[PDB]
Amino acid sequence: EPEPQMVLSPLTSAAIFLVVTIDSGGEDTVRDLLSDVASLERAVGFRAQPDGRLSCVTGIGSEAWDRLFSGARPAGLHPFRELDGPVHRAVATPGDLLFHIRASRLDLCFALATEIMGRLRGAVTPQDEVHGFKYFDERDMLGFVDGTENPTGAAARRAVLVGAEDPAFAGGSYAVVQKYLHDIDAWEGLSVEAQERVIGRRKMTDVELSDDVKPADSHVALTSVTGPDGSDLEILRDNMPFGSVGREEFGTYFIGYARTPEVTETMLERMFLGTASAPHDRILDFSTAVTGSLFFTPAADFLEDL
Amino acid sequence: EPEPQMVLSPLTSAAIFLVVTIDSGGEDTVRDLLSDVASLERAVGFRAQPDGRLSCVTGIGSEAWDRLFSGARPAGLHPFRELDGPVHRAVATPGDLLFHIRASRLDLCFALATEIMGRLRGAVTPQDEVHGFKYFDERDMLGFVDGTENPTGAAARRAVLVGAEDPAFAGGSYAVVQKYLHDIDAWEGLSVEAQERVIGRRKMTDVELSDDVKPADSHVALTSVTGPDGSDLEILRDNMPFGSVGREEFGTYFIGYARTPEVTETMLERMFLGTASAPHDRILDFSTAVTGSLFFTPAADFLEDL
Amino acid sequence: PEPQMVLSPLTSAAIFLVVTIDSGGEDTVRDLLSDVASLERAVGFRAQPDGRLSCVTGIGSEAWDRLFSGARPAGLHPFRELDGPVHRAVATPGDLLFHIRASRLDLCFALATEIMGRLRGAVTPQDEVHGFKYFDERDMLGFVDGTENPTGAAARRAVLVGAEDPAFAGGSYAVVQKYLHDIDAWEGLSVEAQERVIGRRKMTDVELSDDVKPADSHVALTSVTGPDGSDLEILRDNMPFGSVGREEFGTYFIGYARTPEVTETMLERMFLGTASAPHDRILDFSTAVTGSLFFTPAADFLEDL
Amino acid sequence: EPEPQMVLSPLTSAAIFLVVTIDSGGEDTVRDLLSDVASLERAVGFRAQPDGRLSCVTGIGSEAWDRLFSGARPAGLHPFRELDGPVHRAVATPGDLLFHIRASRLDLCFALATEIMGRLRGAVTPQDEVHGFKYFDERDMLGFVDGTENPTGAAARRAVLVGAEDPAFAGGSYAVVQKYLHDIDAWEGLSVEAQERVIGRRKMTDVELSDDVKPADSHVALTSVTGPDGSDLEILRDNMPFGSVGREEFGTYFIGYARTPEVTETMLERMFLGTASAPHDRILDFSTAVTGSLFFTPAADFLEDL
Amino acid sequence: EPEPQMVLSPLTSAAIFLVVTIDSGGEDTVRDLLSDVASLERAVGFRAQPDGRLSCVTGIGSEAWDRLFSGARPAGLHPFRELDGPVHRAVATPGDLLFHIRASRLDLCFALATEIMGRLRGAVTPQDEVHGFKYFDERDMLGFVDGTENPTGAAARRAVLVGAEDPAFAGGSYAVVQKYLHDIDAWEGLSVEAQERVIGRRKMTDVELSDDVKPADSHVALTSVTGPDGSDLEILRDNMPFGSVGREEFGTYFIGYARTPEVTETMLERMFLGTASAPHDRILDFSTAVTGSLFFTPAADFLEDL
Amino acid sequence: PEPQMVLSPLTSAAIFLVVTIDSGGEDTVRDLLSDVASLERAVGFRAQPDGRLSCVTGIGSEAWDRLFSGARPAGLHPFRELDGPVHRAVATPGDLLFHIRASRLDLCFALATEIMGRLRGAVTPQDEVHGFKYFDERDMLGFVDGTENPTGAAARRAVLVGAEDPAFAGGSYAVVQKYLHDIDAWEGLSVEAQERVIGRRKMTDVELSDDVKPADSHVALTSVTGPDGSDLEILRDNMPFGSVGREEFGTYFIGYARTPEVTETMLERMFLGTASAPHDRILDFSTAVTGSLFFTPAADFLEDL
Ligand code: HEM
Ligand code: HEM
Ligand code: HEM
Ligand code: HEM
Where would I find the H helices in E121-254?
153-160, 184-187, 192-199, 219-222
The number of beta carbons lying within 10 Å of the beta carbon of residue A86 is: 10
Instruction: Enumerate residues 6+ apart whose C-beta is below 8 A from F298.
Output: F1, F2, F3, F4, F168, F169, F170, F171
Q: Is F148 annotated as a binding residue?
A: yes
D236 pocket-lining for ligand 2 (C-beta < 6 Å): no
User: Is the CB of residue A15 less than 8 Å from the CB of residue A240?
Assistant: yes
Chains D and F touch (3+ CB pairs under 8 A): yes
Residues of D in contact with A1 (CB under 8 A): 154
Which ligand 2 atom is nearest residue D145's CA? Answer: 10
Look at residues D118, D123, D104, D113 and name the one whose alpha carbon lies nearest to residue D41. Answer: D113
For ligand 4, atom 32, the nearest C-alpha belongs to: F222
Per DSSP, B87 falls in state S
Residue whose CB lies within 8 A of the most ligand 3 atoms, among E254, E272, E284, for a mutation test: E254
Closest ligand 4 atom to Cα of F144: 10
- CA-nearest of D293, D249, D251, D245 to D268 is D293
- Spell out the residues 6+ positions from residue A134 whose beta carbon is closer than 8 angstroms to its own: A11, A12, A13, A14, A240, A241, F104, F106
CA angle (F290, F295, F300) in 5-degree steps: 140
Interface of E with D (CB under 8 A): 16, 18, 20, 105-107, 110-111, 113-114, 117, 121, 126, 128-129, 131, 133-136, 243-248, 250
| Chain A residues near any Cβ of chain D (below 8 Å) | 1, 3, 39-40, 42-44, 46-50, 111, 115
Q: What DSSP string describes B3-64?
A: PP-STTPPP-SEEEEEEEEEPTT-HHHHHHHHHHHHHHHHHHHGGGTTT---EEEEEE-HHH
CB of D143 within 6 A of ligand 2: the answer is: no
CA angle F293, F299, F302 (to 5 degrees): 80
Asked if B257 and B59 count as a contact pair (C-beta separation under 8 A), the reply is no
Q: Which residues of C190-218 are buried (b: 16+ CB within 10 A; e: fewer)?
A: ebeebbbbbbbbbbbbbbbeeeebbebbb
CB-CB contact of B125 with B20 (8 Å) = yes
In angstroms, the CA B172 to CA B2 distance is 9
> What number of other Cβ atoms are within 10 A of residue D231's Cβ?
9
Q: How many domains does chain F have?
A: 1
Q: Is A248 left (phi over 0), alpha (psi -120 to 50) or beta?
A: left
Burial (0-12, 13-18, 19+ Cβ within 10 Å), F88: middle
Residue A289 contacts residue A90 (beta carbons within 8 Å): yes
Measured CA to CA, the distance from residue B272 to residue B284 in angstroms comes to: 8
The residue type of F19 is V
Q: How many CA atoms lie within 13 A of C107 on its CB side?
A: 28
Query: What burial class does residue C150 get, using C-beta atoms within 10 Å of its C-beta: 0-12 exposed, 13-18 middle, 19+ buried?
Result: middle
For residue B219, give the amino acid letter.
H
Please, are residues E138 and E223 in contact by the beta-carbon 8 Å criterion?
no
- Contact (CB, 8 A) for D235 and D263: yes
Per DSSP, the three-state class of F56 is strand
Task: Measure CB to CB from residue D133 to each of E106, E134, E244 and give the nearest one.
Answer: E106
Which residues lie below 8 Å from residue A101, measured CB to CB, with a gap of 6+? Answer: A15, A16, A17, A18, A54, A55, A56, A109, A112, A113
CA distance E157 to chain F (A): 18
Between chains, do F153 and E49 touch, taking CB under 8 Å as contact?
Answer: no
Contact check, Cβ <8 Å, C2/E154: yes
Q: Of E269, E266, E261, E291, which is closest to residue E98 (Cα–Cα)?
A: E291
Q: How far is C4 from chain E (nearest CA, A)?
A: 13
CA F288, F290, F294 angle in degrees (round to 5)?
A: 125
E165: Cα separation from own chain's centroid: 22
- F244, A105: Cβ pair inside 8 Å? no
Closest residue to C190, CB basis, from A136, A137, A193: A193
Pair F118, F35: CB distance under 8 Å? yes
Kindly report the nearest CA distance between residue B251 and chain E, in angstroms.
Answer: 19
Nearest one of D157, D158, D135 to D145, comparing CA atoms = D135
Task: Tell me the residue type at F15.
Answer: I
Q: Report whether F249 contacts F188 (CB < 8 A).
A: no
Cis peptide before E50 (omega within 30 of 0): yes
CA-to-CA separations, E75 to C253, E7, E173, in angstroms, rounded: 55, 19, 11
Within 13 Å of residue D162, how many CA atoms lie on the same side as its CB? 27
Q: Residues A238, A257: contact at Cβ < 8 Å?
A: yes
Distance, in Å, from the CA atom of A101 to the CA atom of A113, rounded to the nearest integer, reads 8
What does chain E come to in residues? Answer: 306
Separation between Cα atoms, residue B253 and residue B98, nearest integer Å: 13
Going by C-alpha positions, the residue among D127, D125, D120, D126 that lies closest to residue D29 is D120
Interchain contact, B126 vs C19, CB within 8 Å: no
Single-letter amino acid code for the residue at D164: A
Q: Give the distance from residue D241's alpha carbon to the nearest chain E alpha carbon, in angstroms.
A: 10
SS3 readout for chain A: CCCCCCCCCCCCCEEEEEEEEECCCCHHHHHHHHCCHHHHHHHHHHHHCCCCCCEEEEEECHHHHHHHCCCCCCCCCCCCCCEECCCCEECCCCCCEEEEEEECCHHHHHHHHHHHHHHHCCCEEEEEEEEEECECCCECCCCCECCCCCCCHHHHHHHHCCCCCCHHHCCCEEEEEEEEEECHHHHCCCCHHHHHHHHCECCCCCCECCCCCCCCCCHHHHHCCCCCCCCCCCCEECCEEEEECCCCEEEEEEEEEECCHHHHHHHHHHHHHCCCCCCCCHHHHCEEECCCEEEEECCHHHHHCC
Inter-chain CB proximity D137 and F142 less than 8 Å: no
Domain carrying residue F199: 1-305
H or E segment at D159? helix D153-160
Q: Take atom 42 of ligand 4 and give the residue whose Cα is closest.
A: F222
- On whether the CB atoms of residues F247 and F187 are closer than 8 A, the answer is no
- How far apart CA A83 and CA A49 sit, in angstroms, is 43
State the distance from the centre of ligand 1 to the C-alpha of C145, rounded, in angstroms: 7
Q: What is the C-alpha to C-alpha distance for residues A146 and A150, in angstroms, rounded to an integer? A: 9
Q: Which residues pair with C16 in a beta bridge?
A: C99, C129
Breaks in chain C follow which residues, C to N over 2.5 Å?
A: none
DSSP B170: T
Please enumerate in sequence order all residues whose Cβ is within 8 A of that of E228, keeping only pairs 6 or more positions apart, or say none: none
Q: Cβ–Cβ contacts within 10 Å for residue D197, how many? A: 17
Separation of alpha carbons D236 and D157, rounded Å: 10
Residue D24 contacts by C-beta under 8 Å, 6 or more apart in sequence?
Answer: none
What is the stated resolution of the deposited model, in angstroms?
1.5
